[PDB]
Amino acid sequence: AQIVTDERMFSFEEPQLPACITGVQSQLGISGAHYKDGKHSLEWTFEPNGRLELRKDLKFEKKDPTGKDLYLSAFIVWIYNEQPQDAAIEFEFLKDGRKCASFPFGINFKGWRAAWVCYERDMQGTPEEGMNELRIVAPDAKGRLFIDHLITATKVDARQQTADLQVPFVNAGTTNHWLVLYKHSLLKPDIELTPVSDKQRQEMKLLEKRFRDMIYTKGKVTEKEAETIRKKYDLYQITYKDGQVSGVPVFMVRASEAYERMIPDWDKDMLTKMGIEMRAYFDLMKRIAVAYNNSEAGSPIRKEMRRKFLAMYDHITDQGVAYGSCWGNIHHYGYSVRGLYPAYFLMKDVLREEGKLLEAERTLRWYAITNEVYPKPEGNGIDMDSFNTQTTGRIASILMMEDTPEKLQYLKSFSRWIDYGCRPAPGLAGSFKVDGGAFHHRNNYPAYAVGGLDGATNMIYLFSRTSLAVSELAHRTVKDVLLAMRFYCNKLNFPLSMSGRHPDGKGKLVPMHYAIMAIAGTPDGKGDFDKEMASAYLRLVSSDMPKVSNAQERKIAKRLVENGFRAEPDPQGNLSLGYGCVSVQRRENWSAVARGHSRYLWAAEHYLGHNLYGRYLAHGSLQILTAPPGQTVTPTTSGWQQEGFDWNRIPGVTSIHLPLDLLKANVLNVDTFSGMEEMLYSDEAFAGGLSQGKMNGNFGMKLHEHDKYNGTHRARKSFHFIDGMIVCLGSDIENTNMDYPTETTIFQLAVTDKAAHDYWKNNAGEGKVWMDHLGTGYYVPVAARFEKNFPQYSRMQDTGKETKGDWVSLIIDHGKAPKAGSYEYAILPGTDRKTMTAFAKKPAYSVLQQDRNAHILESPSDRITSYVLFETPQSLLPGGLLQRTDTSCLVMVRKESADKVLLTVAQPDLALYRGPSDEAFDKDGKRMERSIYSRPWIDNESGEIPVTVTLKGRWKVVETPYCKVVSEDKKQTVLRFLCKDGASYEVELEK
Ligand SMILES: [Ca+2]
């Protein structure tokens, strides 16, 4: 049966020809030899310059004059050619006598090709409402064509029609990355052609082995697997008639958009529901290709799978999956075509034997848009989504080629593309950053990074230890990103604040990335294995020879253990992500992760039905990820679950406690640069941390909630990470909300097991000293309120459905509409009762100042002075050594002895733009919501900011490109730091 029956739809399934179709100097007939729908098509056998005339009301309708409806009326056909001709058909559309619109259609192809052409945009001339004739003018030569699936005119999503070799003129304006297969296939290389050397030929052989092993591992073909294959394959009804291939027509899902304005009950996924879509088809081909490689040479099953693969190949190529073919509409083809590339690659040698390899090679190159690899990168970094989706297809298509100089040129081009793609990207752009941050949607986004890393990681390894290897810079950048991720995840899970739009506590890092990079070798190429990567890997899969599921990962892991590699100890020290506004302190097995936001970096991503209540995720959050020594750190072990969680009381934040219906994100489409999303960045540049000797550090932020919600709410918050202690300081907390209280939350923890319930039965706890059921201590000198809510009510992050759980909370109660609120408390994770009582009697720190100007603090035992300087300090700074500062910044001083001092400085202002905050103001003076994508500075290089420090006494320093001594006398020593990227710059001082 033909899908969709309509007066405008010509499918030729009737025994007699339609009376309205007549042929001039040509013969017409119903043929069953080729068909795109039903079981028949129109055979049009023509003499030179013969016409095919369809005399019926074409039912073209002019575009909506109001502009409300953007759909354009389109003509749609499928043409079949048995004999390719270096010529073109002309399509003519006439009202009564005269032609109004026309378009050319190339016929230099074998098989089915489509054309979706919009009357108003893509056609020559001007279309008219009421035209009632279709002419198909043949070229000045004889030949034959089969016509099927002809829709005269119907309204269609105007964005989606794609150009190819048959219709290069279609949608000339578009820059849609999905639709530019033809445009970008025309691109030419700039890397010069060279012949292939013996070493280079062996290297290409090596990339193929590496790639085959990557997508495939030898296995067994079960009787069940074989029966499933036969059942799925038979439904396609692939058969041969007089040398011609036919079978059930296969479309890619979006081809349904043709019938959108045609059927009342339209379903976008109707073709998938019919088993007629491409994903299933190419999935089966992969399935069969795998089965062939898992069978003994000369066996009946191997011959059977070889036979089935080729039959499926012939049919899909006949249907139009070939070079220079885009089926009229190709948007979002990526997902349907995922199986294509591995299926064809696994079947290289057999395709060559059949004389079909060159063809196969070209179709892969076409659909992977491999020529996009030709251009010289203009800068560092590419879209994370490129690494995520474009790597597999492109590399497979290149490995399909014969060992020719053209293949080497492609390889050189591909390596160059990956190389610059991995390099530190500027601003909020690219993929990877100098400090280890990984960007997508213009912030650090682990959930997306994870997918992008798959590509980058796999391609680095593929090209590794070879003349085509990527630069040290590219290799080290990705390595550092992975090392950072291992640091801020604990053990494998993303922290809550870094969950993006999925705060479900499920997102994890991928151990594979580490194992792949371990066998990639050191970034310089001098080491066969990467030691840091290997031991990082073995920690992440440590059981507590490891146990793993994925076959190719198990192979690598076996190699690493045999080569004597052991698991990492839990990473120690301090991380500061300038790109992402995150600081992490790590001692023992625990971690403390701080996250804020700036005028460059958004607080939280809100989508429809995703992350409804996460407004406060970056309001200076501080999550403690922990577990009893010996057990793996999990959100569950760190005292977090989704059900029952008070979304207002994100650990560490200063926020106004709202009812969930008021806390929910009011998601809007704010401008043309975005969709239904909320991504709120502040108007303050001062947010970030410093990292001293990768061991300790501090964090500071000027918190300022967006005017969309509680815009009066602002605060100065700081974190000070000294050894196994995190001291939290706050001042200048203020808002004008008199309906709901402002709170900083010391901790909010889930009570799950029996032992947790028994611990809280009467635990007071004191006193100036608290200790939870997870073994972490809290020194709280200020007045604080304790809540034991068994149970506590909340809602799901996505669905909003009511959830409950047993929760325990300690909060610092600022009033309703505070004027100048403040707090001071310290967190010591993985401690004991004894240390805590001793800490209460003699705190290991002393506050030097705590106001709008600065939060300064020292620890005599650790020999450390911490400076969070919010403003230029007009006055002599406390501490004894650091006297004055040029501009608002972060400083930390460590005293080795009276003679040796370690000085470290950071400038949290990323400086993507230089002036006052980029803002669009209201009639009343409120900040207007504008999506980050709309800002013109999002790709800017981080600006250099000079920071000058004044130090007491004579000091000698070794000069660096980033640190210079400016002025010097008997009393003072001033130094100038050249700051970038929110990075931490440090120097060693000697008296
Ligand atoms: Ca038909």
UniProtKB/Swiss-Prot annotation:
The record marks R159, E605 as: Important for catalytic activity against all substrates. Ca(2+) binds at S11, E13, D37, H40, D148. Belongs to the polysaccharide lyase 8 family. Its main location: periplasm. Transmembrane segments: none annotated. The record marks R501 as: Transition state stabilizer. Divalent metal cation. Requires divalent metal cation for binding of dermatan sulfate substrate, whereas it is not necessary for the binding of chondroitin sulfate substrates. Prefers Ca(2+) or Mg(2+), binding 1 ion per subunit. It catalyses: Exolytic removal of Delta(4)-unsaturated disaccharide residues from the non-reducing ends of both polymeric chondroitin/dermatan sulfates and their oligosaccharide fragments. It comes from Bacteroides thetaiotaomicron (strain ATCC 29148 / DSM 2079 / JCM 5827 / CCUG 10774 / NCTC 10582 / VPI-5482 / E50). GO terms for biological process: carbohydrate metabolic process; chondroitin sulfate proteoglycan catabolic process. Pfam families: Lyase_8, Lyase_catalyt, Lyase_N. This is Chondroitin sulfate ABC exolyase. One of its GO terms (molecular function) is chondroitin-sulfate-ABC endolyase activity. GO terms for cellular component: extracellular region; periplasmic space. It is found in: Periplasm.
